[PDB]
Design a protein around this ligand. Structure first.
Ligand SMILES: CC(C)c1c(C(=O)Nc2ccccc2)c(-c2ccccc2)c(-c2ccc(F)cc2)n1CC[C@@H](O)C[C@@H](O)CC(=O)O
Lengths: 120, 533
């Protein structure tokens, strides 16, 4: 695994209508990320970095925020080395851009995609 | 540096490394508990992982390593200790950001890595003491190995100093140093959610062990059956007698020094080592100096160790006569009104002063009033108003109006008569520490002369197993059991207070009996040696 750093790209972000469902994806490239947790953060405009979810190295530990509980489910694929986030039964208070965090050596963040949620 | 002195320098550095690592494990375990969100049984099992890893393989490494290249195996063990420290610091590097967010009268699986490297540290502790000290004995000149052992045990006490200073310094900072701007953290180090930089402690311990690993690999081998040998060790009556003896004596040492601070708190009232460390380091080097300069043989070293333990127990017997008076506590030893003593401390009757307002009877908020009687809560002290506590009505007087308020919080200190007895206690503990260090190297130094010269490594490994197993583990367990049978107020957990006369009697008398048994085994052992030699 001769690489410079770990690059993280989000996918599946897009506009929704009412309490729909979103399919968020975080693809990592570079170093082996077999052993590292991956987190999901949100960045609402006018507010700081709020933490949303996390997944362990093998997916044995699923730890979530108290703000979104019972509807968000985080999942991992080690072979594709990609972390998914199922979102359902949403409210427009969840409208933010979602960053993907891993700390293989150094703390790494992604570009983020707009997970804008309409009112309905 | 005549070749051997380089090995003694490297072995002293490795002794500093392992004694530093032990203090880091003892110090940074609460931060691991707060960070990993693990339970008490889990964190105890991680704490005992070191004893599991050491006690599984210590006799096998000490037996099979004596015929091999000894300093290379010590360097391999030091490298495994460093890899274990680095692996213990490793789970911080890939988890992410840590997340953290007056009783008035009313009228998830990353801990395994912290486990596993600890087991590595157990193997890291494994070949240092048996294979190292034995490699001292066959090539140091006669009488000199006691001096080198005293020098090494004096030098190895630098390790706890480095561990204490680095542990306090790195616990003063935050665990996410270098990753987050420090002005964004709202909590203080005094808070219950604070986690210090434990990974920095394990990183400096692992890198110190790794740096100490290199000087072993360039040292030469010489400066210029398992059941059969283990049966030969066990069938020696002098050796099994000495091992049972040293088990009893070291168990007394460990059961004392685990609960010295609790004994001080529950006897003299002073709450829980700047001067004691020069005393210990001078005592051990003095013990090596007396053994080297006076040309003591094996019966001479046995008699010298017996003499030092006789003076240690002679000063230890003096602790019965420096007991302070029992605490005047309302609701445990006497009733709440302060007139009638109670027969037993289980299910005491309630008083008419504190019958009115219903508070928690199991709540422990220690206060004392003007009269010096300790009260267990301001609800049960009758205090209804607080700024200090005022209008306390559970203090009977014959019309003294001013003796109704001015009761501070906390266990207020005892009389000045036994405050001097506390200083006597500390001075006698300094003398006991000095004479225990003066005994010191004799426990190792008798073993290498009792056995055959080609089983000294196996003998030291088996003795180290026995001391770390039945003295290091079980002895605090039964000392805590016998001590906790004297608890007087159970918090629903550990008891807050003790029955000071009973707790003093049990804690002193168990170690006294456990010392006089080894003192009898002195006369048996020197009798056997004088019959043999
Ligand atoms: C810190 C160290 C030098 C020490 C002391 C001490 O000086 N205590 C001290 C503390 C405060 C003030 C003054 C002195 C006592 C020590 C000395 C006297 C009395 C009690 C403990 C011991 C020790 C020795 C045998 C045991 F079975 C257990 C611990 N040890 C450990 C030495 C060695 O047996 C254990 C080794 O194999 C593993 C390791 O290093 O972790």
């Amino acid at each position: 695994g001769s690489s410079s750093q770990v690059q993280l790209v989000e996918s599946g972000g897009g506009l929704v209508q009412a309490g729909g469902s979103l399919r968020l994806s975080c693809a990592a490239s570079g170093f082996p990320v077999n052993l590292s947790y991956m987190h999901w953060y949100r960045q609402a405009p006018g507010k700081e970095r709020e933490w949303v979810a996390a997944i362990s190295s093998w997916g044995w530990h699923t730890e979530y925020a108290d703000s979104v509980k019972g509807r968000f489910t985080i999942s991992r694929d080690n072979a594709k080395n990609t972390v998914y986030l199922q979102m359902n039964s949403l409210k427009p208070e969840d409208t933010a851009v979602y960053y993907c965090h891993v700390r293989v050596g150094r703390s790494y963040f992604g570009q983020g995609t707009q997970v804008s949620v309409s009112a309905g | 540096c005549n070749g051997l002195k380089m090995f003694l320098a490297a072995l002293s550095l490795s002794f500093i490394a392992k004694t530093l690592g032990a203090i880091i494990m003892k110090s940074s375990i609460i931060h691991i508990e707060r960070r990993f969100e693990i339970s008490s049984s889990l964190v105890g099992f991680i704490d005992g992982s070191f004893e599991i890893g050491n006690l599984l393989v210590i006799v096998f490494v000490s037996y099979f390593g004596s015929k091999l290249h000894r300093p290379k195996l010590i360097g391999i063990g030091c490298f495994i200790m460093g890899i274990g420290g680095v692996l213990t610091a490793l789970p911080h590097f890939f988890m992410g950001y840590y997340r953290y967010s007056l009783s008035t009268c009313l009228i998830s699986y990353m801990w395994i890595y912290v486990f596993m490297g600890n087991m590595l540290r157990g193997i890291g502790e494994t070949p240092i003491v048996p294979l190292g000290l034995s490699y001292i004995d066959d090539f140091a000149k006669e009488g000199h190995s006691s001096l080198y052992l005293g020098i090494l045990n004096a030098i190895a006490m630098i390790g706890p100093i480095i561990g204490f200073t680095l542990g306090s310094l790195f616990s003063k900072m935050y665990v996410d140093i270098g990753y987050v701007d420090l002005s964004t953290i709202r909590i203080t180090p005094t808070d219950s959610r604070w986690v210090g930089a434990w990974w920095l402690n394990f990183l400096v311990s692992g890198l110190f062990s790794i740096i100490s690993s290199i000087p072993f690999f360039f040292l030469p081998q010489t400066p210029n059956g398992f059941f059969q040998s283990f049966k030969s060790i066990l069938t020696n009556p002098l050796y099994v007698m000495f091992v049972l003896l040293t088990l009893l004596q070291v168990s007394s040492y460990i059961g004392a020094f685990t609960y010295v601070f609790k004994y001080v708190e529950q006897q003299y009232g002073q709450p829980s080592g700047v001067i004691t460390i020069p005393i210990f380091a001078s005592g051990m080097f003095l013990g090596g100096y007396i053994i080297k300069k006076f040309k003591l043989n094996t019966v001479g070293i046995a008699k010298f160790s017996c003499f030092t333990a006789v003076m240690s127990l002679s000063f230890y017997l003096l602790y019965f006569f420096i007991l302070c008076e029992n605490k005047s506590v309302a609701g445990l030893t006497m009733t709440y009104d302060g007139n009638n003593p109670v027969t037993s401390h289980r299910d005491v009757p309630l008083s008419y002063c504190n019958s009115d307002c219903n508070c928690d009877e199991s709540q422990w908020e220690p206060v004392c009033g003007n009269n010096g009687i300790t009260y267990i809560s301001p609800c049960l002290a009758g205090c209804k108003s607080s700024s200090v506590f005022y209008n306390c009505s559970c203090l009977e007087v014959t019309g003294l109006q001013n003796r109704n308020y001015s009761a501070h919080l906390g266990e207020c200190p005892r009389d000045d008569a036994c405050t001097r007895k506390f200083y006597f206690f500390v001075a006698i503990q300094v003398l006991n520490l000095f004479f225990s260090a003066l005994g010191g190297t004799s426990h190792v130094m008798l073993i290498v002369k009792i056995v055959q010269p080609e089983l000294k490594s196996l003998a030291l490994g088996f003795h180290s197993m026995v001391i770390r197993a039945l003295g290091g583990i079980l002895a605090p367990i039964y000392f805590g059991a016998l001590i906790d049978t004297t608890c007087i107020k159970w918090s629903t957990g550990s008891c807050r207070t003790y029955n000071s006369t009973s707790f003093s009697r049990v804690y002193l008398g168990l170690s006294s009996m456990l010392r006089v048994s080894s003192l009898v085994l002195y006369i048996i052992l020197i009798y056997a040696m004088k019959k043999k030699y």
